[PDB]
Coordinates of C-alpha atoms (C1' of nucleotides) and ligand atoms in Angstrom, one line a residue:
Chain A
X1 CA -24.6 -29.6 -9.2
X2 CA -23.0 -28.6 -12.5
X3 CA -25.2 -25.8 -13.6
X4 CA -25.0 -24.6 -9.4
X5 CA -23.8 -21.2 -9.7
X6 CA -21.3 -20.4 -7.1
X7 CA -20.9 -16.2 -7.1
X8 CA -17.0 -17.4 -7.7
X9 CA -16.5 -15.3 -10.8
X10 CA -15.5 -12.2 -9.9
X11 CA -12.7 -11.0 -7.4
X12 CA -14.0 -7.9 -5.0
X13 CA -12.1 -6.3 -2.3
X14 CA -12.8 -3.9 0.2
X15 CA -10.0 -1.5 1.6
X16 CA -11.1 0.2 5.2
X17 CA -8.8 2.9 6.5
X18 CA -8.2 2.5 10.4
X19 CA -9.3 4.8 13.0
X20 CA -9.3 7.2 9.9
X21 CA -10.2 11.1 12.0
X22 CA -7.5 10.0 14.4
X23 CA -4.6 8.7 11.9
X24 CA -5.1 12.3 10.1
X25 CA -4.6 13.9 13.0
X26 CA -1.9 11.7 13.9
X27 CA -0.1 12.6 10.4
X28 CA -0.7 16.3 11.7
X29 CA 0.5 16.7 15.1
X30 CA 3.4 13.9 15.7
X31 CA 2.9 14.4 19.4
X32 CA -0.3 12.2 19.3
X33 CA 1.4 9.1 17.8
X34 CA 0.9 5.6 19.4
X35 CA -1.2 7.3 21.9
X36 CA -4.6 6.8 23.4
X37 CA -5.9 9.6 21.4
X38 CA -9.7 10.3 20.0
X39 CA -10.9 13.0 17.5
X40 CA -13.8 14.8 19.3
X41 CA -16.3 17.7 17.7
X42 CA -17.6 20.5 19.8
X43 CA -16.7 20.6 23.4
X44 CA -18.9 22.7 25.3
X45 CA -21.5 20.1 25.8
X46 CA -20.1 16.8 28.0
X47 CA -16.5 17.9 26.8
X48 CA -17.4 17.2 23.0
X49 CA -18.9 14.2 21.3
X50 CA -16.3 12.0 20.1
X51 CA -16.6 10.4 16.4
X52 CA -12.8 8.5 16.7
X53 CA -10.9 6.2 18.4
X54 CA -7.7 5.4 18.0
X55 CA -6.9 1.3 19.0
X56 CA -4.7 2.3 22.1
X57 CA -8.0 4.2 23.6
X58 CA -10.4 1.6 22.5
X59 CA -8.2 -0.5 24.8
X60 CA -9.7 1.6 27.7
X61 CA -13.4 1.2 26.7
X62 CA -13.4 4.3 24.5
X63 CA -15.5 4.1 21.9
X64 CA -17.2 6.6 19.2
X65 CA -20.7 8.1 20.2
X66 CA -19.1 8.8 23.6
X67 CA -18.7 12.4 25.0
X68 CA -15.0 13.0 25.7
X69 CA -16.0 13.8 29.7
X70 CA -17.2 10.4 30.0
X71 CA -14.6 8.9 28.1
X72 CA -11.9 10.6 30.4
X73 CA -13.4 9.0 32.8
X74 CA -12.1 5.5 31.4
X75 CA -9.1 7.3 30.1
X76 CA -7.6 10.0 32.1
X77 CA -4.4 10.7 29.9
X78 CA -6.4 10.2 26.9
X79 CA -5.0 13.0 24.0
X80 CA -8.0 14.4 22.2
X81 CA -8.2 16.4 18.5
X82 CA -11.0 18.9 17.3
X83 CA -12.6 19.0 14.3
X84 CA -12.6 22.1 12.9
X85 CA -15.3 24.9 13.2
X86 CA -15.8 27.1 10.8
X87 CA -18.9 29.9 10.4
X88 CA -20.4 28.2 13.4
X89 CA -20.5 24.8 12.7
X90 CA -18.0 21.2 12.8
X91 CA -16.5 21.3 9.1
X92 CA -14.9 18.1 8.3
X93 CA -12.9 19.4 4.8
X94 CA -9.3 17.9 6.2
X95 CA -10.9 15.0 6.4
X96 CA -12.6 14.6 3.0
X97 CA -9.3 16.0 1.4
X98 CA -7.2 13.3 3.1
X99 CA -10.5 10.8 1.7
X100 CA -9.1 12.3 -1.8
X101 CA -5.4 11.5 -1.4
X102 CA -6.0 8.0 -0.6
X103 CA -8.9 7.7 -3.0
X104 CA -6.7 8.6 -5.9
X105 CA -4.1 5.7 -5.2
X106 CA -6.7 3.3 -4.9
X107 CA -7.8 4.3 -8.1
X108 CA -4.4 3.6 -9.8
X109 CA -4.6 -0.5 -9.3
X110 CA -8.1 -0.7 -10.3
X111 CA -11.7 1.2 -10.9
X112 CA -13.3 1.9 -7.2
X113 CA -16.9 2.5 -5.6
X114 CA -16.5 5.1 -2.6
X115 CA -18.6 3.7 -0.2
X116 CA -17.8 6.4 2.9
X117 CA -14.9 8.8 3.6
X118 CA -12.9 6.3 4.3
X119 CA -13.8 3.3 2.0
X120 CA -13.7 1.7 -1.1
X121 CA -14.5 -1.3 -2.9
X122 CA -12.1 -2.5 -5.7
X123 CA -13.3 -5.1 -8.8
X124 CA -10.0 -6.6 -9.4
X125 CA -10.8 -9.5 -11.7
X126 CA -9.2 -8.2 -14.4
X127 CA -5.7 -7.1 -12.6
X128 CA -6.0 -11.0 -11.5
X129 CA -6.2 -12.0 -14.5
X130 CA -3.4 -10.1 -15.6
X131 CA -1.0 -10.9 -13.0
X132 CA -2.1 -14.5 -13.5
X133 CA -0.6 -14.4 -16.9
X134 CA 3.1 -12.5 -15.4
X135 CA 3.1 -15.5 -12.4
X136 CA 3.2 -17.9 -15.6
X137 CA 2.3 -21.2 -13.5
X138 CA 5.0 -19.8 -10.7
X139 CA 3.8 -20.5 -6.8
X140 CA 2.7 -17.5 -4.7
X141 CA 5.6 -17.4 -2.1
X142 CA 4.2 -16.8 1.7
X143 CA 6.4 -13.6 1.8
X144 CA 4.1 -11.8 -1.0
X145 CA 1.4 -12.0 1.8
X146 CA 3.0 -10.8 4.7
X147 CA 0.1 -9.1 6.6
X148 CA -3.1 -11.7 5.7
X149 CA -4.8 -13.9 7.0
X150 CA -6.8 -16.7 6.0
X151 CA -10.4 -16.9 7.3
X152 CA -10.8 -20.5 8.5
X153 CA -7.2 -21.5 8.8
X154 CA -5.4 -23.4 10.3
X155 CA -7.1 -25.9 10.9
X156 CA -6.8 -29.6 12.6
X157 CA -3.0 -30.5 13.7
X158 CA 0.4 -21.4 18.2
X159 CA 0.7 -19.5 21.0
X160 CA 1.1 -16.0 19.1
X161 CA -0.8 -14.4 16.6
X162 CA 1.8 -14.0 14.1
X163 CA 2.7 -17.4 14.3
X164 CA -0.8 -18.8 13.8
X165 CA -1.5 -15.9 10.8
X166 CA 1.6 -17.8 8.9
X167 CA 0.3 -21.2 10.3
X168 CA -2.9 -20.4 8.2
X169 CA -1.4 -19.3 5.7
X170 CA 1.0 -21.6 4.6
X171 CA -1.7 -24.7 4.9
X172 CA -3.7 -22.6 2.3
X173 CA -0.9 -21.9 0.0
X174 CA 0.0 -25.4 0.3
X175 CA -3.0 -26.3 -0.8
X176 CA -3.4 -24.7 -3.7
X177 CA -3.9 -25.4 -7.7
X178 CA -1.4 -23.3 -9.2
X179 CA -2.1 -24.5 -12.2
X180 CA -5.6 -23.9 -13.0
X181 CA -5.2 -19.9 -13.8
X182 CA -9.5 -20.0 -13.8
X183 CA -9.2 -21.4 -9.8
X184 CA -11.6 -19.2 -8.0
X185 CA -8.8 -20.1 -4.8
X186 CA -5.7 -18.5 -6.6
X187 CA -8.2 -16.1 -7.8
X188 CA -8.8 -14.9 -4.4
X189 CA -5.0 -15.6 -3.6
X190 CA -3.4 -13.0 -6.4
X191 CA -5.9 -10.4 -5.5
X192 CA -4.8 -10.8 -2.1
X193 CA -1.1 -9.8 -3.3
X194 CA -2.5 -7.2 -5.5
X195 CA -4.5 -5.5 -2.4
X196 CA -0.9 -6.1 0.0
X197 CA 0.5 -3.6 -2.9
X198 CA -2.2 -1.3 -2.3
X199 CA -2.0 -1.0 1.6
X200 CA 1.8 -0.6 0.8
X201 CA 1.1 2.0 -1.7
X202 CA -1.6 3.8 0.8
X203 CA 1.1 3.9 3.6
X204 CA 4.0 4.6 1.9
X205 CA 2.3 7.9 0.1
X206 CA 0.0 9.4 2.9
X207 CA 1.4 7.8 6.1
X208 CA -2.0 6.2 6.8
X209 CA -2.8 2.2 7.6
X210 CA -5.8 0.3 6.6
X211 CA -7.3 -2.8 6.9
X212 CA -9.2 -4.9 4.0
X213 CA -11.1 -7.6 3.1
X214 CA -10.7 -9.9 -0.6
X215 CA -13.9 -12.1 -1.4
X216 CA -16.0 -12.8 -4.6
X217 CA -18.5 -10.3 -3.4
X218 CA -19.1 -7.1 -1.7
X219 CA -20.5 -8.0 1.5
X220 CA -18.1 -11.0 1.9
X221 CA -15.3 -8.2 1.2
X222 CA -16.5 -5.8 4.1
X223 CA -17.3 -8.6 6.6
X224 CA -13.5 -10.3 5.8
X225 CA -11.9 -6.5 6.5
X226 CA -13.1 -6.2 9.5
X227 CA -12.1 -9.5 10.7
X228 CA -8.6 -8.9 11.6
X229 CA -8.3 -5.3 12.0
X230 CA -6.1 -3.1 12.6
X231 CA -3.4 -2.6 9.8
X232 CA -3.7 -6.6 8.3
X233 CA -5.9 -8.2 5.8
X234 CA -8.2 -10.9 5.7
X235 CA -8.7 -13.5 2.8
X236 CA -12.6 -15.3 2.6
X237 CA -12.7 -18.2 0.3
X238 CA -16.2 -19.5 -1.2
X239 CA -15.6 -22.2 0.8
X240 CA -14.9 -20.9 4.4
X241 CA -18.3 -19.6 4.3
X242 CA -20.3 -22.4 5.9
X243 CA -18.3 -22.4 8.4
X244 CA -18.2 -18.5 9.3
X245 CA -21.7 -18.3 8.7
X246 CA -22.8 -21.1 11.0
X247 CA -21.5 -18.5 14.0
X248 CA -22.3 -15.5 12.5
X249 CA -25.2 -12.9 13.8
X250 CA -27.4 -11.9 11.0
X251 CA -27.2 -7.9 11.9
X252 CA -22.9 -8.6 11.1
X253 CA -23.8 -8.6 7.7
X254 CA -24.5 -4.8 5.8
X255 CA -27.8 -3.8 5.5
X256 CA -28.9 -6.2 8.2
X257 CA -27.8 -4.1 11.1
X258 CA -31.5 -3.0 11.2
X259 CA -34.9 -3.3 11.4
X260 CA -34.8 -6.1 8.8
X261 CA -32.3 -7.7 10.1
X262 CA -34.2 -8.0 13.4
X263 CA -37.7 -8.8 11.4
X264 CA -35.4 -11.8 10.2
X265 CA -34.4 -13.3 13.6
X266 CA -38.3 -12.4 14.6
X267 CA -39.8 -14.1 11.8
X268 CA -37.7 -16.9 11.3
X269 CA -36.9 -17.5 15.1
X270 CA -33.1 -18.1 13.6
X271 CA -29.5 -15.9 15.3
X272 CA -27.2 -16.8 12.6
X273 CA -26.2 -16.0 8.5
X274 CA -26.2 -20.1 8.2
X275 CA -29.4 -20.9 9.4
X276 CA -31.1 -18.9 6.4
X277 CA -30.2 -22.0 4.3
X278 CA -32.9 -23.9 5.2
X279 CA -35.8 -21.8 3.8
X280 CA -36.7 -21.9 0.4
X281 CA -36.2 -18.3 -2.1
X282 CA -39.9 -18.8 -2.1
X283 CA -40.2 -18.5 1.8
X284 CA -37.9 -15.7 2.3
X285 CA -39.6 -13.8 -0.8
X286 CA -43.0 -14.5 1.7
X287 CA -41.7 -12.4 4.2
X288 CA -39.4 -10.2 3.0
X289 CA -39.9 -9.3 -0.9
X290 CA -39.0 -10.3 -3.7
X291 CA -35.7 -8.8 -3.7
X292 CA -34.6 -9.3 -0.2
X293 CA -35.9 -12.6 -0.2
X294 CA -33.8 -13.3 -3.2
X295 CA -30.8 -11.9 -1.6
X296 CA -30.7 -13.8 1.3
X297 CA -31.2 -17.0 -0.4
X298 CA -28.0 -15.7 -2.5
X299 CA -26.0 -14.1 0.4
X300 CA -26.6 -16.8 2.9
X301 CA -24.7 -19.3 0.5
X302 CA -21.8 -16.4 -0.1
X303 CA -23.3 -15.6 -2.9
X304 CA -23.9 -11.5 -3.7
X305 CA -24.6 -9.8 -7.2
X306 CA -24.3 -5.9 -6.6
X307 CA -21.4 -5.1 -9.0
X308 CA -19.0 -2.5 -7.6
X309 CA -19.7 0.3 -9.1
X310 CA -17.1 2.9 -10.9
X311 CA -17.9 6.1 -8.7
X312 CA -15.0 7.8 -7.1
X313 CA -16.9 11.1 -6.1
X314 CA -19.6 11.7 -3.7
X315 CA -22.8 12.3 -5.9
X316 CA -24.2 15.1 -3.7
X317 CA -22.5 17.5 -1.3
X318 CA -24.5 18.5 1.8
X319 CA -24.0 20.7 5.1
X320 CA -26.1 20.0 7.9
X321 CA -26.6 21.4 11.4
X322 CA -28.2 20.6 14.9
X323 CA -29.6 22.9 16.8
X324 CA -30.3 20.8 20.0
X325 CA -32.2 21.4 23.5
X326 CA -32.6 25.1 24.3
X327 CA -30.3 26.2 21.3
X328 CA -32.9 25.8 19.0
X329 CA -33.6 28.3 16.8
X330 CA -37.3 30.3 17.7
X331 CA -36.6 33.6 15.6
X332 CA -36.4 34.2 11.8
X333 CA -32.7 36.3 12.2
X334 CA -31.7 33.2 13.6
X335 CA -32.9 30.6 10.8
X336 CA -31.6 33.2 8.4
X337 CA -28.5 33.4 10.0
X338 CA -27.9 29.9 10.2
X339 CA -28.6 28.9 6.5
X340 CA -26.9 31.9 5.0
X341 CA -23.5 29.8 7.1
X342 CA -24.8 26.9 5.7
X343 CA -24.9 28.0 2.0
X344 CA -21.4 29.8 2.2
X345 CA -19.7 26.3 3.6
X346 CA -21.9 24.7 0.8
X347 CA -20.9 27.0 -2.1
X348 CA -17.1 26.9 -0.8
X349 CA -17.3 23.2 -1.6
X350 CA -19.4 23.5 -4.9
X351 CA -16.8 25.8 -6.4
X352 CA -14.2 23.9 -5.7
X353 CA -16.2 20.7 -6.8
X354 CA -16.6 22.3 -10.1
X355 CA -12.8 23.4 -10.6
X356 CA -11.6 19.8 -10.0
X357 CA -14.2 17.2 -11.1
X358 CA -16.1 19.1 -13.6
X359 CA -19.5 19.1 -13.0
X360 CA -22.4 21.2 -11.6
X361 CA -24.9 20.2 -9.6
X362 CA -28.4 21.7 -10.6
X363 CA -30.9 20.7 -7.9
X364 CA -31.0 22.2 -4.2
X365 CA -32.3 20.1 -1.2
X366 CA -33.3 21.6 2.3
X367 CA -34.5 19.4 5.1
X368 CA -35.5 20.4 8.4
X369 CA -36.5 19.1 11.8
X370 CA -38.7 21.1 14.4
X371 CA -38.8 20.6 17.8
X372 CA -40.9 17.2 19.0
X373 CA -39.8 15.2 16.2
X374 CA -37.8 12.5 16.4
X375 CA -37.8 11.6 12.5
X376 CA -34.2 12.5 11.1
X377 CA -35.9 14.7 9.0
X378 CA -39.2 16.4 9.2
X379 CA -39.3 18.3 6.1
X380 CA -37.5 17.4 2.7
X381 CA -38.3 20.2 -0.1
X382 CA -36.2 20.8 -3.5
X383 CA -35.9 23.7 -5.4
X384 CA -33.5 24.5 -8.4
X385 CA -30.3 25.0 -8.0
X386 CA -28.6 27.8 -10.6
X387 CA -26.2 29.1 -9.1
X388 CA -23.2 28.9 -6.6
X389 CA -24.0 32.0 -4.3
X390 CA -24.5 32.0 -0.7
X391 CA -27.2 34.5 -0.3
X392 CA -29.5 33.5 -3.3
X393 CA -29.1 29.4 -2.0
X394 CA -29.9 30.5 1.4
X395 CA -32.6 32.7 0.0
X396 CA -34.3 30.2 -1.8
X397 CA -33.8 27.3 1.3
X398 CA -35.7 30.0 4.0
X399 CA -38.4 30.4 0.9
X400 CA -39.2 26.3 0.4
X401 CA -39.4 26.2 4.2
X402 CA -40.8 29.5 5.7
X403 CA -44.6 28.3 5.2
X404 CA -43.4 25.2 8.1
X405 CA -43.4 28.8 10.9
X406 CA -46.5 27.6 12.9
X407 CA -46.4 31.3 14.5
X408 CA -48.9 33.6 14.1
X409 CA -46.0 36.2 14.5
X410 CA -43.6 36.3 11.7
X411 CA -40.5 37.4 13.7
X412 CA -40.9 34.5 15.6
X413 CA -40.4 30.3 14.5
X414 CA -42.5 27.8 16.0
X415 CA -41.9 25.3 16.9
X416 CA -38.2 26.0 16.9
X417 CA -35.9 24.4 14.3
X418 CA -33.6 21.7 15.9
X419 CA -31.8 21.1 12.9
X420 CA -31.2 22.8 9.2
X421 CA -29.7 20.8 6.1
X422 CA -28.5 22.3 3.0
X423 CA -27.5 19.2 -0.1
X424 CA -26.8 20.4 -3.6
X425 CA -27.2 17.3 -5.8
X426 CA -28.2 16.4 -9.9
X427 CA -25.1 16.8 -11.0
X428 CA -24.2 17.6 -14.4
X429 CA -21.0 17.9 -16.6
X430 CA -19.6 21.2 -16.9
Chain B
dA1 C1' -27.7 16.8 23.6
dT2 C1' -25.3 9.8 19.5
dT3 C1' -23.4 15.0 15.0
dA4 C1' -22.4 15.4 10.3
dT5 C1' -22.8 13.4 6.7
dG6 C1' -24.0 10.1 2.2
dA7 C1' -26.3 6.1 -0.8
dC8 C1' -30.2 3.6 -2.1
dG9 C1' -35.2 1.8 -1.8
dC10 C1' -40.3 2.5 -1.7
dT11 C1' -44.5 4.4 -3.5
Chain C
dA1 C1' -40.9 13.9 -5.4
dG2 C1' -40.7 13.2 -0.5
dC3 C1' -40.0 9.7 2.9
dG4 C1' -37.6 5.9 5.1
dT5 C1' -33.7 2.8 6.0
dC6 C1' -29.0 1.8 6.7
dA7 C1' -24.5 3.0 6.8
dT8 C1' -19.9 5.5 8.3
Ligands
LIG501 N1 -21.6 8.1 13.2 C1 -20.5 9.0 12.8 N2 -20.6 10.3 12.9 C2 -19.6 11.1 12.5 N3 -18.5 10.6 11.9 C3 -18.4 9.3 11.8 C4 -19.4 8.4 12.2 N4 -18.9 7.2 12.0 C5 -17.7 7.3 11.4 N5 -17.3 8.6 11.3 C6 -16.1 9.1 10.7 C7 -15.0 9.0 11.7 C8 -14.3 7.8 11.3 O1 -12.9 7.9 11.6 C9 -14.5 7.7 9.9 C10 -14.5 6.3 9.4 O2 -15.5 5.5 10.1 P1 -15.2 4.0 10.5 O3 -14.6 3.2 9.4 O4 -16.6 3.5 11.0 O5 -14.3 4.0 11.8 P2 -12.8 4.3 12.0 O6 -12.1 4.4 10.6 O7 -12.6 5.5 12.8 O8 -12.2 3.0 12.8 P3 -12.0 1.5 12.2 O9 -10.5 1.2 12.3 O10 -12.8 0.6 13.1 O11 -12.4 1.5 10.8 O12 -15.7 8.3 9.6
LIG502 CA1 -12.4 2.8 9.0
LIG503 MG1 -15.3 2.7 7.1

DNA sequence: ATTATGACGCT
DNA sequence: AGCGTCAT
């Protein structure tokens, strides 16, 4: 009852940029504007292996993990960018650099956590509270929220979407308690206006669109963005969760996409995020730890603790590289070659990483995979880190991992190397 | 031959 | 530390 804690307290959203690869490119070349257009990297192999889709191509079947000669096949006009190569290999710098510019706006609203290249979450309790105090007991006006919707509504007593987003809306406007400034609803509501700001300050400086989600929580953030994407966001109240979740397949929710997430429909013989109410914390600490267990007694009520946190930059900077099928690597020039490319991407990055963010990373990663395998990884070995050159990182990478050369013959590798991976983390303050 | 990343959990 | 899981 009274002492039921609710997960209301805090206001968290989550801003998503749409179709991201392809809007930079769009930005770029004008020509592949409101087009059925994908961002594809390599091209050789099945015409490239596309990793973005813009929504007038997904509209064709196109989809990401699809090679571009299969998706022509669904989309014959379909306009296609490259990612760049550079020393050999995809290098994805435009796209981290356009991460930045949109990063840094985020970041003037409220504190973020960078949760991918092209995501953040945003704790904006305190700007609520703040903006609370400015509205002084005045309504929010339906025109402050022109591109959200309202998970759930309308409800009871329409033919276009538009009209049934401000349908929605004005029922849950109308139905709210301006006057309690501690109303987890108006809550919800202002951060809602504050994250319309955003978008609008993300578009009008970069030229990009985005999508997001406002919640009490960060899964309840990211599952509300994607609800009504492209370019619009989505508004889940504490109390639309029943409903949603009463529908909603377990893997949805993040960190349930995988094997747990199955283990849970398995073990419990359940489909849906509502159906987890029924077991006690107990029960679901039985099968699925302590802390999971915990977690989904929380999340399954929409309740979530993980706090966002205040990290803006990556915390480790890593260049990685497949060598696949018959172009793996089976001689020592070759492995030599490949991480010497390797390091000078990766020490292009760390110097420029400690010009603007002031910091050095002190501790070198190389990973490995050899043919047979089908592990990610086969091989994960550190070594330290002490400078930013090329040749002594790559160096030091072929020394951790030369002892893994099964062959008898030292000009030769076996089995070949089907993938290399450079990371330079442990960062420090400089 | 679904590539190039990046964070966090386990032991 | 090195490995695994999950994610974009
Ligand atoms: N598996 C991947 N491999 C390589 N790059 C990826 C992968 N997934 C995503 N990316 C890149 C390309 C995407 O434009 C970008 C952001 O990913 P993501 O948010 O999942 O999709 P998206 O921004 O392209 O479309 P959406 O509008 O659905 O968000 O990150
Ligand atoms: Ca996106
Ligand atoms: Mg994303």
């Amino acid at each position: 009852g009274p002492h039921m804690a609710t997960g209301q307290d805090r206001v968290v959203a989550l801003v998503d940029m749409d179709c991201f690869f392809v809007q930079v490119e769009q930005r770029q070349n004008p020509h592949l504007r409101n087009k059925p257009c994908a961002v594809v990297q390599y091209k050789s192999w099945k015409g490239g292996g596309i990793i973005a889709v813009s929504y007038e191509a997904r509209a064709f079947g196109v989809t990401a993990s699809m090679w571009a000669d299969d998706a022509k096949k669904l989309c014959p006009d379909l306009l296609l960018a490259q990612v760049r190569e550079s020393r050999g290999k995809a290098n994805l710098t435009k796209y981290r650099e356009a991460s930045v510019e949109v990063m840094e706006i985020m970041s003037r609203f409220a504190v973020i956590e960078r949760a991918s290249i092209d995501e953040a979450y945003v704790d904006l309790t305190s700007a609520v509270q703040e903006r609370l105090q400015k509205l002084q007991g005045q309504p929010i006006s339906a025109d402050l929220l022109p591109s959200t919707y309202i998970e759930g509504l309308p409800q009871g007593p329409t033919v276009q979407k538009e009209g049934m987003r401000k349908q929605g809306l004005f029922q849950w406007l109308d139905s709210l308690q301006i006057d309690n400034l501690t109303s987890p609803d108006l809550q919800l509501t202002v951060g809602a206006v504050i994250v319309e700001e955003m978008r609008a300050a993300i578009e009008r400086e970069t030229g990009f669109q985005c999508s997001a989600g406002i919640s009490h929580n960060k899964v309840l953030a990211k599952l509300a963005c994607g609800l009504n994407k492209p370019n619009r966001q989505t508004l889940v109240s504490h109390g639309s969760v029943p409903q949603l979740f009463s529908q909603m397949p377990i893997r949805k929710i993040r960190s349930l996409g995988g094997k747990l997430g199955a283990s849970v429909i398995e073990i419990l013989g359940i489909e849906y995020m509502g159906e987890l109410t029924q077991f006690t914390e107990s029960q679901l600490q039985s099968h699925f730890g302590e802390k999971n267990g915990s977690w989904l007694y929380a999340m399954c009520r929409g309740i979530e603790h993980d706090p966002v946190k205040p990290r803006q930059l990556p915390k480790t900077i890593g260049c990685s590289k497949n060598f696949p099928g018959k172009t793996a690597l089976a001689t020592r020039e070759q492995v030599q070659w490949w991480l010497l490319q390797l390091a000078q991407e990766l020490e292009e990055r760390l110097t420029k990483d400690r010009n603007d963010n002031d910091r050095v990373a002190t501790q070198l990663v190389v990973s490995i995979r050899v043919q047979g395998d089908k592990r990610l990884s086969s091989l994960r070995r550190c070594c330290a880190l002490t400078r930013y050159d090329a040749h002594k990182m790559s160096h030091d990478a072929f020394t951790v991992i030369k002892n893994c050369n099964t062959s008898g013959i030292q000009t030769e590798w076996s089995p070949p190397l089907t993938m290399l991976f450079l990371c330079a983390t442990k960062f420090s303050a400089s």
